[PDB]
Amino acid sequence: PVYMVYVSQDRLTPSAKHAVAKAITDAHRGLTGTQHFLAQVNFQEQPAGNVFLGGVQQGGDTIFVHGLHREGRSADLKGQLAQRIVDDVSVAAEIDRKHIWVYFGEMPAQQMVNYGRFLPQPGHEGEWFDNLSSDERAFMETNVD
Amino acid sequence: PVYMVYVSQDRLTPSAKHAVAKAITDAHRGLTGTQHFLAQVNFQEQPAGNVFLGGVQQGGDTIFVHGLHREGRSADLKGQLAQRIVDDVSVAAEIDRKHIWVYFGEMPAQQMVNYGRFLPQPGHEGEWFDNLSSDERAFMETNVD
Amino acid sequence: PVYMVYVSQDRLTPSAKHAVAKAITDAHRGLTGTQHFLAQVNFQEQPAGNVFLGGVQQGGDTIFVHGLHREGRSADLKGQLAQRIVDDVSVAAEIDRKHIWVYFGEMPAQQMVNYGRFLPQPGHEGEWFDNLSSDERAFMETNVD
């Protein structure tokens, strides 16, 4: 996946970011079986005060996670995945769950690419990896924590 | 909703950003009936020259509103709301309508989280607010302008 | 279309950004027939190290392109468009393809707005353009490279 994580500048240190990225990568990997290296977590920082709720300028605690997935998973699974992102990001970032927003968007995997290659179905995988080139697998492999 | 508003650095003063978040919120509240505090407006500033139109580097006037919505509203209502954002952001930003881009993407409510709580179906916002705990209600209410 | 291009700060020179913008814009025009000026490319820069892959902090080479399209085109055409973006952005940015991530999200053209006006369906740009007002046509024509 790609997780776009919109946060305010400075609210997360480099170690909070890694912590926030590990909590999200673990949830997605744990609940969908997708391998570690296929989860991209992309932090988008903006100055505090660029977030408004009900037209009221916010401080710098709001966290919005926009997850871009392949279609084909159940509402159950997606429900569990989002709840675990709320819980586990709350822990990692040391924020109150009342600051955490999470939207999952789904596209067909036919029109999705990571590492220059078209993704599998969630009902494939493994064999998509083993069908990649060895230099391709190798570069992917350096991306596991 | 979550409205990501892509503007150029310093195109919108702090005062201009507040009036724009206010316009967007008031349009979405007035046309869908969701409470103000559920309306998030997240400004994404980037230096001028990061927008290209047909390969022509642009100055800092272009505004892209990306609206993230729950599924279930008519094409009619979505039409009216998009037009009202164009007009109302134009006044609030004092910007000709020709610079304004607005896209609405929709996702099932069951995979969408708001203040750490899953959203109801559209039209069911009052029963879902009443169901919230007292501290959660009070906290949301602070976010109303 | 709107192409949000996520890259680390200073990874792209101002001329490489033009070349990536041109590469995407000519890909989209070539295969969809949409006029040059309807292609928006919006660079979203972040400091290097805000991207994680499998929990591993990255340098500034990763490029994620999130294309936002109208519904109505075939899986096959979107496959060719995605592959072409990978190939030609690779060239224009001097970045190996394996750093490049491409996702296409689709929406009904009835809830999408370019230059203050609603898009037509994916067959009817010419007649849509011809029926615009003469100042709008003139403004759109300026954004062609």
Automatic annotation (TrEMBL), chains A, B, C:
The UniProt entry, under SUPFAM superfamilies, shows: Tautomerase/MIF (SSF55331)
- Where the record annotates domain Tautomerase cis-CaaD-like, the positions are 1-128
UniProt: (R)-lactate binding residues: H28, R70, R73, N114
Protein origin, superkingdom: Bacteria
| InterPro entries, alphabetized | Cis-CaaD-like, Tautomerase/MIF_sf
- Which Pfam family, an example, fits this chain? Tautomerase_3
For this entry, the protein name equals Cis-3-chloroacrylic acid dehalogenase
Native source species: coryneform bacterium
